[PDB]
């Protein structure tokens, strides 16, 4: 047969994205956070292009297409970063970009060490669970449809249909080589648990970037155009409970 | 905005 769905995810997977960080300069909270913010701006461009190219994505109302991306970019970017860390330096450090690799010192200079530890842990989960490149791809796609407003989307039905189909695909990726039920059942359990763990991490980073935006001018931290807008219009909706993640387990 | 221009 032909792995049509997987052929697609693989084909549309974004390439390498650098942050343009000056590693020849001593680490500073301002320089580091400003470099992460610009990396977010650059990655967002690739996330938009990636999403628009996902199977069925254009079925969503245009307003919803923008909404899911605006709400999920953090989890998506954190997830992809954890995988990069796992496969490049084996989770030893957080591989944000080839030119922005965090060691313990940078994790501390960034003033978000605790959040970094969790991201490093998630990164290790990729190794502990032996996540395959294909499971990573489908799990990441599912993360784009994992957070919605409690009041529902413009066209909620189309979204529900899309999310269901991506869960179905994740389910068949699990039953490719496995020919045992308790086996597939166990794997699905582990992955959904893994997907859920991304949410608390994104929440912390959402709170952290929000507070940073509010007083960025006082700490010399620069927020690019799209980042500043999304963080002050969309992120608050999340922090105030108007928009929530979809958890598999509670 | 620039983000919106991506779908507009
Ligand atoms: C999404 C990014 C940048 C892309 C990536 O690889 C994951 C990483 C997670 C932390 C984010 C960062 C973008 C800029 C943020 C939002 C900072 O303001 C504080 C948290 C940072």
Author numbering:
A (entry chain A): 669 to 918
B (entry chain B): 99 to 106
Please quote the paper that reports this structure.
Androgen binding to AR leads to activation of genes involved in the development and maintenance of the male reproductive system and other tissues such as bone and muscle. AR is distinguished from other nuclear receptors in that after hormone binding, it preferentially responds to a specialized set of coactivators bearing aromatic-rich motifs, while responding poorly to coactivators bearing the leucine-rich “NR box” motifs favored by other nuclear receptors. Structures of AR in complex with FxxLF, LxxLL, FxxLW, WxxLF, WxxVW, FxxFF, and FxxYF motifs reveal a changing surface of the AR coactivator binding interface that permits accommodation of both AR-specific aromatic-rich motifs and canonical leucine-rich motifs.
Finally, effects of substitutions at the +4 position were assessed in structures of AR in complex with peptides containing FxxFF and FxxYF motifs. Like the tryptophan peptides, interactions with Glu897 are mediated by Ser−2 instead of the peptide backbone. With the exception of FxxFF, motifs containing phenylalanines at the +1 and +5 positions present canonical main chain interactions with both charge clamp residues, Lys720 and Glu897.
